[PDB]
Amino acid sequence: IVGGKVCPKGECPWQVLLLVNGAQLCGGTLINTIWVVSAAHCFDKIKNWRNLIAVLGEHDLSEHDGDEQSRRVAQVIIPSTYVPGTTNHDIALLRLHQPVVLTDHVVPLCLPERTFSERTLAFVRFSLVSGWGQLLDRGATALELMVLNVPRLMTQDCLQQSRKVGDSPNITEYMFCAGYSDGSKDSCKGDSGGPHATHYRGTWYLTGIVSWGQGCATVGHFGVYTRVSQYIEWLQKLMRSEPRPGVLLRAPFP
Amino acid sequence: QLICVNENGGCEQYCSDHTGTKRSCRCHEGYSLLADGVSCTPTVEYPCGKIPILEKR
Numbered sequence: 382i383v384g385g386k387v388c389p390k391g392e393c394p395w396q397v398l399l400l401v402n403g404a405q406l407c408g409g410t411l412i413n414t415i416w417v418v419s420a421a422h423c424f425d426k427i428k429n430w431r432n433l434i435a436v437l438g439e440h441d442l443s444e445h446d447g448d449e450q451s452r453r454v455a456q457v458i459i460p461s462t463y464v465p466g467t468t469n470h471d472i473a474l475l476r477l478h479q480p481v482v483l484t485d486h487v488v489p490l491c492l493p494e495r496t497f498s499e500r501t502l503a504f505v506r507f508s509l510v511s512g513w514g515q516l517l518d519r520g521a522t523a524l525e526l527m528v529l530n531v532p533r534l535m536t537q538d539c540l541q542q543s544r545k546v547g548d549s550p551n552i553t554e555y556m557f558c559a560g561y562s563d564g565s566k567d568s569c570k571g572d573s574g575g576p577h578a579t580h581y582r583g584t585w586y587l588t589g590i591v592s593w594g595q596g597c598a599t600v601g602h603f604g605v606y607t608r609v610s611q612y613i614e615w616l617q618k619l620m621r622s623e624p625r626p627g628v629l630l631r632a633p634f635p
Numbered sequence: 636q637l638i639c640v641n642e643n644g645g646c647e648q649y650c651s652d653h654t655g656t657k658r659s660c661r662c663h664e665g666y667s668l669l670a671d672g673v674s675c676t677p678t679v680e681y682p683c684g685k686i687p688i689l690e691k692r
């Protein structure tokens with residue numbers, strides 16, 4: 382997170398820390414006691430599927446305070462339409478082996494219904510983005526969980542306000558822009574998979590996933606996020622399924 | 636007739652349209668609908684999308 386602040390401990394209780402062989406991999410969002418929503422691109426280079434851990438109630442990486450809860454990831458579900466190394470359909474649904482215990486420091490973010498998310502949440506201008514990613518482009522990652530408030534843009538406006546760059550990926554109906562074009566504030570690669578959380582009438586909802594951008598907080602560019610509303614039914618159906626042997630599962634999308 | 640299209644039909648969380656001018660508001664799991672028919676109240680200690688340290692202070 383570039384140009385944000387420390388998220389006070391317990392104020393981002395749905396934030397997930399994903400680890401592989403104990404090493405920081407990505408962010409994620411707890412949506413109930415068993416399920417975590419993240420980015421499909423987080424798993425492009427995974428060889429050790431059995432060493433994937435989701436840590437809940439994490440705040441400071443340098444110390445164990447007793448609020449952290451770790452779970453082994455039993456399954457990583459990715460839509461069939463996602464192509465490794467590309468940007469479209471950047472979503473992953475993660476099943477924890479056992480549920481986490483909800484506490485003051487461990488609370489899910491609401492996965493909203495599609496129509497409510499499209500008609501109401503899509504028009505709440507500001508939303509929070511968080512993670513232990515880079516504090517600067519080509520800089521060190523954060524030791525304490527960081528949070529940033531970002532405004533959402535309509536894709537036509539995002540395209541007009543962005544510097545034209547050759548071979549830049551298309552911003553599809555499965556993505557949205559949020560952030561600033563002045564180089565001051567953005568999410569970064571280390572925040573990948575992390576939440577874009579929207580407030581509505583006293584409750585927070587999942588509307589986006591840290592996905593991609595041209596560098597981090599680059600002048601003339603915005604952060605690009607997975608448009609979660611396009612995946613509500615796909616996620617709901619999978620949450621009702623039985624797990625299958627093998628951690629990685631490619632599921633048909635739609 | 637269409638109701639949910641207009642200001643989420645007054646619903647705090649989810650809106651459902653029914654035959655005629657009937658509208659039903661719904662809530663996410665861990666919440667129940669109040670008798671006003673629009674508001675949602677938690678049924679559990681840790682409902683989704685609420686920050687306990689902020690809710691308790």
Ligand SMILES: CCOc1cc(OC(C)C)c(F)c([C@@H](Nc2ccc(C(=N)N)cc2)c2nc(-c3ccccc3C(N)=O)c[nH]2)c1
Nearest residue numbers: 422423425467468471568569570573592593594596597604
């Ligand atoms: C579909 C992803 O598409 C991407 C395309 C990118 O570049 C475009 C071609 C322009 C790009 F830079 C990134 C990086 N993520 C972000 C994210 C946010 C912001 C931002 N400014 N908001 C910038 C960059 C990234 N994540 C990894 C990564 C992170 C953890 C585990 C594994 C990996 C991995 N797969 O290498 C490597 N690189 C992703």
Ligand SMILES: [Ca+2]
Nearest residue numbers: 441442444445
């Ligand atoms: Ca810690």
